[model samples]
Target chain A: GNPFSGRTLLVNSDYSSKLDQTRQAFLSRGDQTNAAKVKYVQEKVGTFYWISNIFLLRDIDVAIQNARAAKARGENPIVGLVLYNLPDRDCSAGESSGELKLSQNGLNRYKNEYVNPFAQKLKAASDVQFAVILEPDAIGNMVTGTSAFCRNARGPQQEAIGYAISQLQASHIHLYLDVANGGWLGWADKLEPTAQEVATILQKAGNNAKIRGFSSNVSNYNPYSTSNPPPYTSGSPSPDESRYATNIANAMRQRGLPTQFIIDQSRVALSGARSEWGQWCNVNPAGFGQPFTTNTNNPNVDAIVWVKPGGESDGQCGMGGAPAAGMWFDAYAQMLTQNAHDEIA
Target chain B: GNPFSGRTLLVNSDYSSKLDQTRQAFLSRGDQTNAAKVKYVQEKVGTFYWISNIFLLRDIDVAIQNARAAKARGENPIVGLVLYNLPDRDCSAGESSGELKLSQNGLNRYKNEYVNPFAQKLKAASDVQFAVILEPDAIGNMVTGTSAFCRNARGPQQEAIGYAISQLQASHIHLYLDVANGGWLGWADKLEPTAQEVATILQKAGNNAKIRGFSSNVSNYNPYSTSNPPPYTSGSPSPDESRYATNIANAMRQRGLPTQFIIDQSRVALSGARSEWGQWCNVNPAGFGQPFTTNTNNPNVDAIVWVKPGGESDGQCGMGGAPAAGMWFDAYAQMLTQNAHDEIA
Candidate 1:
């Protein structure tokens, strides 16, 4: 069992403020379609509002107090934080194109300005169990990226991520290094190489015991595959997150590395809603998948968790005109709630 | 009937010259390290209609001369050219940009400087057969345009394209209007509308007999599923060139138009090497697909032609150490040649 077991998770209020803006704005118009639905989102933050502005942070203690009370109540509460900023964060794509560049003293800034402060803040916190999903799309791009950015920053990501994994370790804080999703590196050739890459970074970071496992499908819509998993077709890659995570886990185990998984079931469609599996933008028809639960059947997978909060725009891409990354979109939020097969508990 | 039937597509000198300058004799002599690999690509990249952009409209006359000399040899030969220089061409993207802008009376320049001269040259040539893929990505943008460039210059594009189609109706000239590929308008909803869009252009241009058909998957890496294909999955867009072109051809018939279809199979991969169906830029890990052939099974479809030359970058995006759009990146040529399931004949 992991930190996110019976207590489920701390729905860090970072995502709740997103709903508040729209909640009042829509409610002001005497409209109430998303009014009731907005309240449902406040209860499920998926706690990833950790942003690095001012070489300082925001509202850390507010969410800390909520989890602080949960732990005081002797509840098995875990706060999930995402260390998203890095030197050349998402080197593969322009979205989430980070604040610093590796070529421009970015590594030092990442270490001093972002990660160092981020780690020191957590190091000061109480017995609050924090689970961190490492920088979102860095490592997977290292394995198979062909972008000039990916090539330029791949080595930097390895060093920075290793530095992050090494520095952010505490007995209570668990680190799940992101390894992208099924649609990216789920094929036979890419899986083991990806595992080896993860193992190398973890190894260099001194293989701390708190380096819990690898996270897959962070902020992506590769499904959890809980029901009617794809048939084992020859030569076909793992078709969903469950299978991909499982395969990656097995690859990790074969390499004698930590194998626990955290699959992001944030934006998902059970059947044929998305136009393409590789589309990672603000897809119009996506629904909020299974909520915070530790009920995944796969052994290595800790939980089919919500690594990416629903309703927030991924980037200014996809079918509809999207807002800037992480900005609230009413249509996206509405569908995630409306079309989710599972109701928010 | 397909223009490429029985007669294998003329090995375009522009591409062959590209091979000569980059890899064939020069690359072989410069470095013997990748000797056979160079030949593998040289053998594999037997492709494209030489695009007459601003920089290289002169290739058109040279191509005409090549085919003219071929006719002098008492041989059945055909030359292919690409009319890709409409005003503000490729309005949806920055890559493959045109020399003329619609705001600058680019249509006037295109008619006089590019298309009119282009048509007159072909019209004067009696014996030489010429196949032109007209103004790539121009019409497709008309249907699903979102760019300011696309929205602002829509009528100008229609007028220019209509003018080119109207003027270039020579007995020796066969016109294949470029209609993007499966990824753009392959879904059921976009299919009929796209067909009607193409229909409107051809209709305005007088629907000349030499108006061969619509070309699909040009310079894209959609699979040439001659062996196996994705299932007819529900709500799925057509995943490859064959299915998409077939749907296009079938749609064209409802408009009572010419239904002959050409598919560009220059870049292909057997497995899903892509993250999304919409990834149309310089796709790395791509393979050279089935060679120039008219052995298409669809009733109205033409040949599986290499419309877009292999080894050319669509943009400086995606995989490979990409050059600019349409420039030969040596890394990509090697990749395509290496991953090809079948040898180009």
Candidate 2:
């Protein structure tokens, strides 16, 4: 293997209960296209790093391990990092049961004791470039009129996320805070106002340069098409809901913010040319990214990055489509096939 | 209209969202086979006096009103009263999360406010013969060990249920304490022991006698056949890992403590037969008493009644047999048709 050139090599660091099976499938033994495409994404696009693991609930050890393994093989030489230790994660009280619940305080303790220790361990073990995606679901998810801001303790949540980001930034890691894709977090037409509000939140949080850029399309894969039924035909994602990353990038730029888009490419390889919303869990190898629009004119997106890791479950709804059972196989294969550098091979 | 001499019209009062949908599908509608089977199970086999719609989670007030409507049309008699206020009264941290994680303080507040107040209102609304299944998931779900029991303040849950029972009994309404299904608390096989503990706690709290028996098979349906496999099939639900209900009930009986059994006939009709050794969720609906044996051997099981109003989805794996899109419609039909008083006629 040449120093400058790269080749697919199955690495060994993909065992963790935190990751579900589908993620392991992609990590251990990559799908046919993933292996080849991952290699290309890393070298060609110079964008290899996703800060997410399967379940972003209460674990981060798998993320640290996977990042180390990817570096061992000299993959993008840059690992993506995430600072997600939100206590009240997954605050979506089902429509039937209107109860706001929080995960254990162990998550907070883990942030203090485990995450920093683990991050340091990986940092020492591997001399790799890194990008930090600080808390995707935490910020945009605190819907204004909802519980946190209104009834529940929104101040603590906001502070906790801010503190976590600050600590992560102090570690000399390049950080990027995630905002929801264009539509969600607020009404559709109020995108500009919403961006301003988000900007205000980030500004108050401090640490500008270390906060590399604003991230959109983090979890939501909205189509950027505005052809008013002018885009493609049947197979494309719906217009009303689908988010086009370009729109989000423009939104950020309009708000006088630097644009860096991190598209969750883990399950998009089979999505063809359009974004597949809510189709991440059950993905076919051939069906990946067949649903993403990473076209060149999308100048708004700086580096089309794979922000979500491959091993964790989409929480309760299990691996949507893959053959494997739990987190093991999915995480390993994700490592094997994931290349943070390229949009697609 | 039958009192002791007239036709004994009994209506079940408890049903989860899924179960309610199932009952509505067939019970309330013109179809009678499925509806009659459920009605037949309760009316013919035991004096269960099914009394749901008392207190459901969130804005189930609409559902409560709907239940009252059903009662008006001679579906459930006026005396088959449901607790209306509990659905509206909000408990800050209620035991709605089920057994694994009960909110003690919430449970207590719920009892004093919702259960106790509703018991009074329910008493004034209609002179009905009622067996209050005070929070089904909580009573049968109590355990000795587990994180929940250890961490939560004990005063709330135990006291709340006990007080609720006491208050209701003082009002002369029949009451059944639901301690939890047949299972262990935490890692300990101390279900019966926990029940005794809860009983003692209730007694010490100056509230006694309201709790006549323990209600089993609340939202879930688990047969006593697991440990002692039905005489028909040699299949035994593993003692080490079988179901909690089998051993829990057995343990309850060993102590000579008296408690009546309320079986969930609604979903059981779908499973055909009673189960002892296998999964209770997927039993043969066509076989209730025919293939399933009665607890003639156990004295504690005074009556095998249907407590969990049926036709609801267990929300476990994908729903059985119905098309993906047909779930809501199919569930509605099942609920309506199952309301008839007999299966065959």
Candidate 3:
């Protein structure tokens, strides 16, 4: 079930609602000038993931209801949701670490408490079409050998991902497992192993045909266009997401798995400034990238999406000007908006 | 009768209202992406002057009502209105032309059809405090000799402005006359002569005490800070509006006239952004400057005002890319907004 194959995806108010809350809070004590700038940024749409327990499952419920409402307007609308918050998420990273940890009974809590309720909600609301990306950076962190949490306990993390996918057995849902990005896993050695690892886990999880393959560069800055390459100084063979995605598809195809994928181009505008590919936390020269569209000329690609919200901060950036993770940074948002290629719809 | 002597001036919806209409028209047939882009610029407030018939007198009526409502909220609100239409207005300017003409009975029409009704409306709404700017380029055109009609009919245009001021004999109304700009008539020879012409006109028009002195750089881009003067390349002694206003004050005071005035700092963000100070038509690097306030600190200066709407076009420049006079140009508005040093309220 390839959701949004030829259909338009409906933008959810998940990010827009958060911006409203942030704007209202800021407006109370702040000047009306900056408050109105926040309202302008509130126009963009973004995928949602839980930051805590029971994490407003209503966002999913409301977005599902929204998708259904979009259907009555005589159009097919697929809701895009990011299923993040893995055990020891962003394990090696300082800005974002998951609420769940392997040291604690995190795996059990993720399965029983998080994934169980999440999947059940979607299963009941199977009336709405969904494109869910499961656990960004989980498998890639395992392959990269950067996170000790994943390195020390790849088995549990892999098991957690497979279990999450297996529980989400809905025909109306198109499951896309997160495959990291071209910059991180785009290298030949890393790319092959990541795909192999993903295939084996899907096989054990019963490898359902409803799998819509993988998602790349979810919240990271990686250029999707090979024509407009990143700086050669960045030292990555797969400079952009295009060739890296192709390799992932080709590798995954060796095991007879689906190869269609979506790449996040949300913050890839100024990636050339990066000395290397791993400079992901609040990188500068960034901007609002391409709007979500299904015009992937490549046979293996589904769409280019803004999986991470554009206006939200990526933590106190490398330098220290930005706000903490997920807080709305007005200056950063202004730059992103100013640097956008197309007008943010 | 300086309305905002100590109180903050209220922002009217004239420009905001125009932006909304422009966005709606663009949204009807154009892509929603660009339409949303246009909507972001709508958050800004620009001064509005009518380009055609009646020029929306209801804008004044509604703004007055709004100011009254602001009183109930325990705020002293002052309404700022720009009276810009003159016979053969924007003479020698390609982008804008006045509806009334000097070749015909333009002065009679300006007073009867435009100024008479305008003064009547403001006088009737004597309950609301009003700061009215009368005839932006009327006297400026006479001094510059840039327009043949202005030189040939200086008697009529100056009379038109003086009559416009004479009719606005309301105690609640504080009238300011346009003194061209520092870049135009702020020079040694021109400043004295221009001030002489203005003093003579006020003398003949019965030189009322309700006059609030002059308005400098109404729609022109002139630097207001002497420390941040225009490029020496621009070749003007009174480069900034601060010095320009000082010269005007000294010259007018030599004739025993009031020296209090306001300078339009709406588009001063880009003084060096231009090569010649005369290149004001659709110039680049334009943006919002300081908000309206009474803290000018200059003994003779009342406030720094945004007399010209920043979002509205100055007419077509060297190129024919921009729209006609008073039309909203989104790209220009975006630049003005992006260049604003302080956030636009």
Candidate 4:
């Protein structure tokens, strides 16, 4: 079951590498003022790390050990982990391309090698509280039919996710399945299919398999709400991320599933209300997203988290003339750091 | 030139003395559940320290030095300091009556001993950013004519305050004169008179002495605002404290002094929409207030700070069968901890 009580969230300096690039950018430009600003931003936003497939092999174990150590120091351990190893991740997207094909066999291998081992480690570290986001863009694409590659083998994918739920449910964890984001789910037509897919997945997971809720805008730019638009809201996008999440939550409840949401506001600083869904690659104009919080006041919204650490490349879209998807693009990183919304006020 | 540029605030755990008593209360009653709840509250609220006259001699210096040390570690130092050494503090009220009466001699001594030394320390520690709340309930009662003790010697009192403004308005310092709270200035008539008093004070300070803003509800239970109304409001208070602040700001501007406001939300959790101004001292029902913020949208509102740390006694109000003012009453503290508004989720 979900172990997070009310306002408990996670913090770690593992993403300091990205912040280092930001730190270096200002220092190189001979801009000490911005350098200090970036440092403040780093202290506020860059401390929280996103646990991903890369961390699954070694860092997960390290995290559990660290959680134990923190408990000894009388600190409550709330950790963030992203389950990103679903087969055909990003649906053949070049940058976020994964190792596995969309097949039942691959799903089985994932269960054995990744999910099961991760769950065991979690079960071992029962004292620590984990807030887990299950697969960014994976489930989002599955519902929106954007990833035709995942569309064909949906059942096997859901089955694998269900198995993961059954295993992780035994430990101290709160699982939030990722829905794409506001841009994708803002329209009236998109909410039902996405929420229906979520309800069906949770239903298959069974009563014992408690899913916390859904997460939105994983590694994407979308403001939490339109009414309280950030400075970057260009055209003022309607049905902001918060409303999108609420609509999806409402739909899921109609399908006999009540759930909360977590949003990845990592790149919300660059969100300009464009008429169309703009580029998702290494965008140079992007800035840091909202700082972590659980007191967002929306009953359906549990947290506004930075699931994707800023400065990390979002695939090589060539929009920002950046490198491969996962690599740190210094120029883009600097843009984010300099234009960060939550500067020292 | 307030150094605090964002929503960041400070917290210190010296309240361990009071927390210890709360801990004892639960153990003596053998209520482990209540004990655990108190611990949770302590974890959330106890970490924040209150700045009062006692801290002036040593603690303020220690804090300034500590702020310097934090800067060495690349930390932004935003400190909360309450200037509470007015000649007639709390307007000669019971429990908080001061030694100095309202007289020119008393005012002169205050300027020399309290305001001058404090301002000197602040100016010397110009590197550190300080949020100095100038005299909680000092200006608030004076304007409302609520404190007869301040009525006769009002000129000298204002002079002492103007002297404080002239002294404390240095680099990296934000000075906010305390204006009691919403309960005192919620109405149009109240706001006008209060703002007029503030303008007059600022005018006396002259153009060079730029007071950053005004603070509200210092060490008091009146909320930033209320969906709950006391006997003072014409209507239910707005959702945001900015409304109250903006109303006062508008009035102050009409009187030719545009300014901002900071709110002391430490004991806001106890504020409910009631028929009357409830007991102000050691009230058991009070909980935590709004979390600190600088992005309060209202241009007139600078920040909502935890100036008065929750769980501390207001005075010897017999509401909860409590102890004297400033002493931590176990029952009251425990109730506050249990009813803390912000908790680990």
- Each model's number of backbone clashes? 1, 132, 2, 19
Residue B24, candidate 4: alpha-carbon lDDT: 72
User: CA shift at B332, candidate 1, in angstroms?
Assistant: 25
lDDT of 4 by residue, A1-345 (tens): 234444335445556534665676688879887788667655544233444453234567665675676667766657778877776566534212544445335676678877888887778777778888787776666776545555665777788777777778844687888888776665667777787777677777887677888888877776777665544333433357888777787788887775688877777644453434644655546667667776676878877777787776664453444443455566776777667765432
Write model 1 residue lDDT over B1-345, tens digit each, in one string: 566765656667656655544455435556553445445445433355555554356667777776766667665666777788877666765212555767556778888878877887788887777778887777778889877658888887887888889998877788889888777788888888888777677767874434888787877777756445434323645766777777877887777877777778877854666666666677767777777767777766677777777766665557746544555676677666556545532
lDDT against the true structure, per candidate, is 0.70, 0.41, 0.69, 0.65
Q: Give, for candidate 1 chain B, the lowest lDDT window spanning 10 residues.
A: B225-234
The best candidate in terms of TM-score: 1
Tens digits of per-residue lDDT for model 4, B10-125: 54444544466777787787877667765654543312234455323455776677667666777665777777777766653311244344532567667776777887777887
Mark the regions of model 1 whose C-alpha exceeds 4 Å error after superposition.
A21-34, A52-56, A69-76, A94-96, A207-210, A226-235, B1-345
Give the per-residue lDDT digits (tens) of candidate 3, residues B152-191. 6777767777787788877788888878888778777788
lDDT of 2 by residue, B223-308 (tens): 43334434433332322212433444556567655445433433332333444422433333422321111332454443344443
Task: Sort the candidates on DockQ, descending order.
Answer: 2, 1, 3, 4
* Candidate 2 per-residue C-alpha lDDT over A187-288 given as tens digits, one digit per residue, 9 for 90 to 100: 445456546645655665675523555555554434333345323223333232234454444677777775555444433322242343334333333222
Candidate 1 lDDT, A85-121, residue by residue in tens:
7776676652126456675577887888777778877
Every model's DockQ:
0.01, 0.03, 0.01, 0.01
Model 3 CAPRI quality: incorrect
Question: Local error of candidate 3 at B167, Å?
Answer: 69
